[PDB]
Amino acid sequence: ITGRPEWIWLALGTALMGLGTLYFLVKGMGVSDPDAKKFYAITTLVPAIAFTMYLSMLLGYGLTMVPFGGEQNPIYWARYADWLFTTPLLLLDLALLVDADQGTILALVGADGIMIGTGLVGALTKVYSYRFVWWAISTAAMLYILYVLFFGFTSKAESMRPEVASTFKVLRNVTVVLWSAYPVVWLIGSEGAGIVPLNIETLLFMVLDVSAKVGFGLILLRSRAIFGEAE
Amino acid sequence: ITGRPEWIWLALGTALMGLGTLYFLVKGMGVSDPDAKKFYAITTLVPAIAFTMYLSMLLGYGLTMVPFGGEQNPIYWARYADWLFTTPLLLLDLALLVDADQGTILALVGADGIMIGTGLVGALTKVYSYRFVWWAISTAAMLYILYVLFFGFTSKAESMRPEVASTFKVLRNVTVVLWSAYPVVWLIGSEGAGIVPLNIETLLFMVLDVSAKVGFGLILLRSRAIFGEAE
Amino acid sequence: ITGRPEWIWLALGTALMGLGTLYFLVKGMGVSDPDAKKFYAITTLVPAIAFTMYLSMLLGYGLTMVPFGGEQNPIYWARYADWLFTTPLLLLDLALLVDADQGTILALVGADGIMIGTGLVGALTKVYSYRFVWWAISTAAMLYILYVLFFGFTSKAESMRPEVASTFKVLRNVTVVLWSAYPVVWLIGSEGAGIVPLNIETLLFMVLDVSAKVGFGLILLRSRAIFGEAE
Ligand SMILES: CC(C)CCC[C@@H](C)CCC[C@@H](C)CCC[C@@H](C)CCOC[C@@H](CO)OCC[C@H](C)CCC[C@H](C)CCC[C@H](C)CCCC(C)C
Ligand SMILES: CC(C)CCC[C@@H](C)CCC[C@@H](C)CCC[C@@H](C)CCOC[C@@H](CO)OCC[C@H](C)CCC[C@H](C)CCC[C@H](C)CCCC(C)C
Ligand SMILES: CC(C)CCC[C@@H](C)CCC[C@@H](C)CCC[C@@H](C)CCOC[C@@H](CO)OCC[C@H](C)CCC[C@H](C)CCC[C@H](C)CCCC(C)C
Ligand SMILES: *C/C=C(C)/C=C/C=C(C)/C=C/C1=C(C)CCCC1(C)C
Ligand SMILES: *C/C=C(C)/C=C/C=C(C)/C=C/C1=C(C)CCCC1(C)C
Ligand SMILES: *C/C=C(C)/C=C/C=C(C)/C=C/C1=C(C)CCCC1(C)C
Ligand SMILES: CCCCCCCCCCCCCCC
Ligand SMILES: CCCCCCCCCCCCCCC
Ligand SMILES: CCCCCCCCCCCCCCC
Ligand SMILES: CCCCCCCCCCCCCCC
Ligand SMILES: CCCCCCCCCCCCCCC
Ligand SMILES: CCCCCCCCCCCCCCC
Ligand SMILES: CCCCCCCCCCCCCC
Ligand SMILES: CCCCCCCCCCCCCC
Ligand SMILES: CCCCCCCCCCCCC
Ligand SMILES: CCCCCCCCCCCCC
Ligand SMILES: CCCCCCCCCCCCC
Ligand SMILES: CCCCCCCCCCC
Ligand SMILES: CCCCCCCCCCC
Ligand SMILES: CCCCCCCCCCC
Ligand SMILES: CCCCCCCCCC
Ligand SMILES: CCCCCCCCCC
Ligand SMILES: CCCCCCCCCC
Ligand SMILES: CCCCCCCCC
Ligand SMILES: CCCCCCCCC
Ligand SMILES: CCCCCCCCC
Ligand SMILES: CCCCCCCC
Ligand SMILES: CCCCCCCC
Ligand SMILES: CCCCCCCC
Ligand SMILES: CCCCCCCC
Ligand SMILES: CCCCCCCC
Ligand SMILES: CCCCCCCC
Ligand SMILES: CCCCCCCC
């Protein structure tokens, strides 16, 4: 484990995702509202999945070597197995908050799968220049997601209860800022141009992951928007 | 790329799926009917997924070598990753058109997963004679799907609006004819008996894919069956 | 095939899953109740999936070698591909029986995916002591599932029709007893401590699989709880 300088950030990430999972699990014990139960189930699964994948990276299972640039490059593939399941769950939290229609939910989840799937292909591609073709396709899929979150959901939240509109607006802004950083870290990190070393890259993804999952969840599960209007 | 004679058909397929995706995306911009939005989302995702997998084959990522018959045989595995997601989406288009019940939808999607999954196992199997055992199981799963589309959905469409009944009947006939060709191309192509060479096999799958996805989508999204009855 | 002593139990399992699939398929022909159709579709898919994965193990495709303990250990990875899809389908049978809320269904299916996913990682892990870390995480996920089936569903079934309450109680008890045996067989078998040899381990999993899928299905599909109350 300790033979890799980035191990400290993988261990911290593992701990923070595990602690986040347990807090949400305990906090959700005393909840019977069927609407609130939906948000607790979605939001608790997110850091639980991330916990297992951070642990796999810490123990060395989620790491492979990819030859490109005449070098064997360490690629943590477990990140994409994490994101494949956690990013659509996070979008479902937002879509259920605004009572989005089914067709829009399917478009979001499908574009998200394309985003993560093409990012994985780009991470494992051995022809250096082709890695950035996949990065560009994946980034186009992300821009579609961000467009929908702004010019489809925002207008839908305003016609909703005030507390669900204000909570959505906050979580929307958090998501757009944090998610946009991921393609940048990829491009300048060891998967892309190799400007930033792997140990610093790992620290950046850990800050982003914890903020986008545990920070996101703390804002959502403390809001009254997750409960139905009741007397 | 150009070192493979089949590259021209992979490049054409990539272009036609990309163009198809963009047309459906633009055409769906001016749509607010929640029913129509469902069909546009399903139908636009189909060629978008196929685009990415054709590109992976063009660039050489979606290709592996499988030893059988005393030879290293080029097997494009990316086809099955495509079909795993696009064939159930196409069946969902048909099932939603006739307002099929949930139990029937699950049976269709499950049989479809078995069809594609066993076809993938057959494509990667190293014992030559066993490849055709998997082909037979996969073909049995397809025949179940075709039976349901005829002796379960057809009777359901007649009790529906006339425009949804006539549109379903057309898309049903297109699907049964085109899908039935796939097991035949597999059997006589490089995955099976090896009668037809890979470059011709690739041309045939490209014609079938574009017809079953973009041609299918053009018929559906030009129909009024996708809109609810409104004044 | 016959070069492996466990082949006899893989062949028996294949036959019993295939026969089970055909019986459920025939029995479900004469069913039009939309509620009953749901249970028949879920319950017939379970042994059909298991059939294909037992066949892959029989023919040698679903087997790999994992080095640990200074030895190349035969690991049947196809079991986890089976369980990944069949265990959530079995939980869906139970959840639909008691009309569970959506949030609870998602929590069950998500915990089940974590259970199977971490068990697969543990089966393929090359550092011997780490294999049991994954076993423990997977077992914690199972205990969560069992808790929900007892202290969330049981109370919900009592407020239901008497026949659905008594049928659920029976299937609940069958599930908790049979599922609990799996982590024990893993721990003492070739994936874990290696006390029980592989051929005996394979026999035990076959008895458990057939009971948990075909036996489970025979109890459910003979009950009147799967039909709506009708005159
Ligand atoms: C509606 C939305 C959900 C739609 C989703 C969008 C999606 C279509 C976007 C594209 C996804 C696609 C790129 C997934 C590729 C997975 C692949 C990286 C797995 C590893 O295989 C890659 C190479 C080794 O580098 O295999 C070496 C050769 C091996 C012999 C490969 C044989 C196994 C194949 C991988 C079998 C295909 C399985 C499916 C891809 C499983 C789904 C994986 C997940 C990442 C989507
Ligand atoms: C309700 C419906 C959706 C049900 C679906 C029906 C489905 C059950 C039908 C059978 C599907 C099954 C054959 C999928 C097999 C995937 C497999 C080809 C992936 C590549 O692995 C094959 C060998 C190399 O040749 O791995 C070499 C050895 C490696 C060490 C393998 C270890 C990884 C395992 C593959 C882990 C299992 C992952 C799941 C199979 C992922 C789903 C893939 C998709 C193709 C279903
Ligand atoms: C809501 C719920 C459904 C959530 C589900 C819970 C889930 C997150 C729990 C953890 C699942 C995770 C451990 C799955 C790992 C699959 C992995 C074993 C496949 C084989 O790859 C392992 C190594 C060889 O030993 O690959 C060698 C290196 C290769 C180069 C690997 C590159 C391919 C990657 C495997 C791509 C990721 C694909 C996804 C993991 C596909 C889903 C598989 C299924 C088992 C979940
Ligand atoms: C909890 C994890 C989250 C919210 C991860 C989000 C990840 C992304 C938005 C990743 C995007 C990428 C691109 C847009 C292209 C480059 C490759 C990716 C996958 C890093
Ligand atoms: C857009 C792609 C489509 C509609 C693909 C359809 C593919 C099939 C219907 C494939 C069927 C197969 C068999 C029936 C057995 C032989 C292997 C397959 C997977 C080619
Ligand atoms: C039809 C198959 C069924 C119902 C299989 C159930 C399997 C389990 C409940 C497996 C559980 C495991 C653990 C709890 C940890 C050890 C590894 C597993 C996956 C065997
Ligand atoms: C979206 C965030 C990207 C900003 C990356 C900042 C990295 C600064 C760290 C110093 C770079 C290390 C280079 C010298 C080793
Ligand atoms: C009462 C609110 C705080 C509860 C404690 C939460 C502990 C989980 C770890 C959170 C750290 C990361 C927060 C986002 C920066
Ligand atoms: C379902 C369509 C299958 C028909 C295949 C027709 C192939 C004819 C092309 C000529 C065969 C090439 C053999 C000589 C190289
Ligand atoms: C107005 C209808 C035609 C629009 C142009 C569609 C261009 C997408 C490519 C379609 C070619 C394949 C059609 C099926 C044979
Ligand atoms: C949950 C069931 C686990 C019980 C396992 C009993 C196995 C007894 C078979 C004899 C053990 C073989 C050891 C000598 C070869
Ligand atoms: C009339 C009920 C029996 C029908 C025959 C079922 C045959 C399928 C194989 C069942 C054997 C396994 C039963 C569970 C132990
Ligand atoms: C194995 C991959 C299957 C999933 C394909 C994605 C489409 C799923 C459609 C689900 C239809 C709704 C069923 C109720
Ligand atoms: C990782 C594979 C999980 C999918 C298994 C297929 C069954 C899914 C059941 C979904 C139940 C409906 C939830 C609302
Ligand atoms: C185009 C939709 C408007 C909202 C999206 C904001 C774009 C942020 C740019 C992200 C940069 C990634 C490289
Ligand atoms: C048996 C259901 C009737 C409709 C299915 C038509 C069968 C077409 C044969 C396809 C040939 C594939 C080898
Ligand atoms: C803790 C929830 C109560 C019901 C679960 C029964 C636990 C059975 C123990 C299984 C042993 C697996 C190692
Ligand atoms: C080795 C660098 C080659 C540059 C390729 C950049 C491709 C980016 C595509 C974005 C449209
Ligand atoms: C090398 C050819 C061996 C023939 C096997 C055919 C199997 C087909 C099974 C269809 C029932
Ligand atoms: C080689 C045996 C090492 C023992 C590790 C046991 C780990 C079990 C963790 C359960 C909390
Ligand atoms: C609940 C605390 C979980 C912390 C265990 C993971 C941290 C790795 C320490 C080496
Ligand atoms: C929108 C046009 C997309 C065409 C790019 C793919 C074709 C491959 C050319 C080499
Ligand atoms: C319907 C009977 C299915 C039996 C075939 C599988 C058994 C393997 C025999 C070698
Ligand atoms: C993106 C930063 C999240 C901050 C988490 C703190 C929330 C406390 C209510
Ligand atoms: C299967 C052939 C499809 C033909 C596509 C043309 C549709 C234009 C309306
Ligand atoms: C767990 C044992 C199941 C027994 C199956 C027999 C059911 C006949 C109704
Ligand atoms: C009005 C809410 C502002 C939230 C933005 C937070 C950016 C990290
Ligand atoms: C909408 C604000 C985008 C912020 C992008 C930050 C990328 C590091
Ligand atoms: C009555 C519609 C006929 C459609 C069949 C088209 C076959 C390619
Ligand atoms: C229902 C007509 C089937 C046509 C099969 C064509 C196979 C090449
Ligand atoms: C295995 C075939 C079953 C025969 C019919 C059983 C009575 C519905
Ligand atoms: C009251 C029903 C008892 C069922 C338990 C069966 C254990 C195999
Ligand atoms: C609730 C009874 C548990 C039985 C466990 C059996 C494990 C072999």
Q: Where are the domains of chain A?
A: 1-231
> Rounded to an integer, what distance in angstroms lies between the CA atom of residue A46 and that of residue A217?
9
Whole-angstrom Cα distance, residue B54 to residue B76? 10
Shortest distance, CA C118 to any CA of chain B (angstroms): 22
Element (H, E) at C23: helix C7-27
The answer to whether the beta carbons of residues B159 and B178 sit under 8 Å apart is: no
CB of A213 sitting under 6 A from ligand 4: yes
Q: Whose CA is nearest to atom 15 of ligand 1?
A: A117
Task: Label residue A230 exposed, middle or buried (CB < 10 Å: 0-12, 13-18, 19+).
Answer: exposed
The alpha-carbon gap from A37 to the nearest alpha carbon of chain C, in Å, equals 5
Kindly list the distances between the CA atom of residue A37 and the CA atoms of A169, B55, C111, in Å, as whole numbers in the listed order: 21, 42, 15
Spatial distance between the Cα atoms of B63 and B123, rounded to a whole number of angstroms:
12
Taking contacts as CB-CB distances below 8 angstroms, the residues of chain C near B133 are 55, 59
| C60 vs B contacts (CB less than 8 Å) | 127
Sign of the alpha-carbon dihedral angle for C22, C27, B113, B168: positive
- Say whether residue C110 is in contact with chain A using an 8 A CB cutoff: yes
Contact criterion met (CB below 8 Å) for A191 and A75: yes
Q: How many Å apart are CA A12 and CA A206, to the nearest integer? A: 8
**Residue C151, φ and ψ in degrees, nearest 5:** -110, 40
In order, the DSSP letters of B27-68 are HTTT---HHHHHHHHHHHHHHHHHHHHHHHHHTTTTEEEEEE
The sign of the dihedral angle between the CA atoms of A38, A41, A43, A46 is negative
* Cross-chain residue pair B61–A106, CB shorter than 8 Å: no
Looking at residue B72, the DSSP 8-state letter turns out to be: E
Torsion C117-C122-C125-C130 (CA) sign: positive
Does any CB of chain A come closer than 8 Å to the CB of residue C67? Answer: no
DSSP state of C229: P
Record: contact B106-C44, CB cut-off 8 A: no
Give the closest residue (by CA) to ligand 12 atom 3. C218
Contact predicate B175/B94, CB 8 Å: yes
Q: What is the CA radius of gyration of chain A?
A: 18
Instruction: Judge whether A207 and A181 are in contact, CB under 8 Å.
Output: no
CB atoms within 10 A of CB B210: 19
- Cβ proximity of B182 and B208 under 8 Å: yes
Best of B43, B61, B82, B85 to mutate for ligand 1, by most ligand atoms within 8 A of CB?
B85
Please tell me the distance from the alpha carbon of residue B142 to that of residue B126, in angstroms, as a whole number. 24
Handedness of CA C184, C189, C190, C193 (dihedral sign): positive
* Spatial CA neighbour of C12 closest among C219, C218, C220, C199: C199
Q: Which residues pair with C64 in a beta bridge?
A: C75
Residues B71-74: contacts with CB within 8 Å, 24+ apart? B73/B190, B74/B190, B74/B198
Token pair 């300790």: residue: A2
What is the stated resolution of the deposited model, in angstroms? Answer: 2.0
The residues facing B68 across adjacent strands are B71
Contacts of A148 in chain B (CB under 8 A): none
Helix, strand, or coil (residue B73):
strand
Q: Give C129→chain B minimum CA distance, Å.
A: 32
Question: How far apart (Å, rounded) are the C-alpha atoms in residues B182 and B188?
Answer: 10
What is the residue whose two structure tokens read 């394979």?
C202
**Which chains have 3+ CB pairs within 8 A of A?**
B, C
The encoded tokens of residue B16 equal 């036609």
CB burial readout A168-193, b (16+ within 10 A) else e? beebbebbeebbeebbebbbbbbbbe
Q: Is the CB of C78 under 6 A from ligand 14?
A: no
B1-231: in CATH 3.50.50.60? no
* Inter-residue long-range contacts of B200-206, CB under 8 Å, 24+ positions, other chains counted: B201/B6, B202/B6, B202/B9, B202/B10, B202/B76, B203/B6, B203/B9, B205/B79, B206/B9, B206/B10, B206/B12, B206/B13, B206/B16
| Own/partner pairs, B150-156, CB within 8 angstroms, 24+ separation | B150/B176, B152/B100, B152/B104, B153/B94, B153/B95, B153/B98, B153/B100, B153/B104, B156/B98, B156/B99, B156/B100
Q: How far apart are CA C121 and CA C138, in angstroms?
A: 10
Instruction: Identify the residue among A91, A98, A114, A131 best suited for mutation to test binding to B, counting B beta carbons within 10 A and taking the highest.
Output: A114
Give me the residues paired with residue A115 across strands: none
Residue ranges in chain B assigned as alpha helix (H): 7-27, 34-58, 78-97, 102-124, 128-150, 154-158, 162-188, 198-210, 216-221
Task: Tell which C residues from 5 to 64 touch B, by Cβ distance under 8 Å.
Answer: 34, 36-42, 44-45, 48-49, 52, 55-56, 59-61
Instruction: Look at residue B196 and give its three-state secondary structure.
Output: coil
Asked how this structure was determined, the answer is X-ray
**Neighbour tally for B228: CB within 10 Å:** 9
Ligand nearest to the CA of B1: 22
Q: How far apart are CA B60 and CA B157, in angstroms?
A: 43
DSSP assignment of C33-81 equals -HHHHHHHHHHHHHHHHHHHHHHHHHTTTTEEEEEETTEEEEEETHHHH
Query: Tokens at residue B114, please?
Result: 């078995």
Question: Which residue from A64, A126, A165, C34 is spatially nearest to B104, judged by alpha carbons?
Answer: C34
B133 shares contact with chain C (CB less than 8 Å): yes
DSSP state of B224: G
Chain B's closest residue to C49, CA to CA, is B114
Phi/psi for B64 (5° steps) reads -135, 170
- Is residue B118 within 8 A of residue B137, CB to CB? The reply is yes
The half-sphere exposure of B84 on its side-chain side, counting CA atoms within 13 A, is 11
Cβ distance A110 to B39 less than 8 Å, yes or no, reads: no
Write the DSSP assignment of chain A as a string of letters: -TTSTTHHHHHHHHHHHHHHHHHHHHHTTT---HHHHHHHHHHHHHHHHHHHHHHHHHTTTTEEEEEETTEEEEEETHHHHHHHHHHHHHHHHHHHHTT--HHHHHHHHHHHHHHHHHHHHHHH-SSHHHHHHHHHHHHHHHHHHHHHHHTTSHHHHHTS-HHHHHHHHHHHHHHHHHHHHHHHHHHHSTTTT--S-HHHHHHHHHHHHHIIIIIHHHHHHTSGGGSPP--
Q: How far apart (Å, rounded) are the C-alpha atoms in residues C50 and C57?
A: 11
Q: Which residues of A touch C107 (CB under 8 A)?
A: 41, 44-45
Would you state the structure tokens that stand for residue A162, as one six-digit string?
């005030």
Min Cα distance C60 → chain B (Å) is: 10
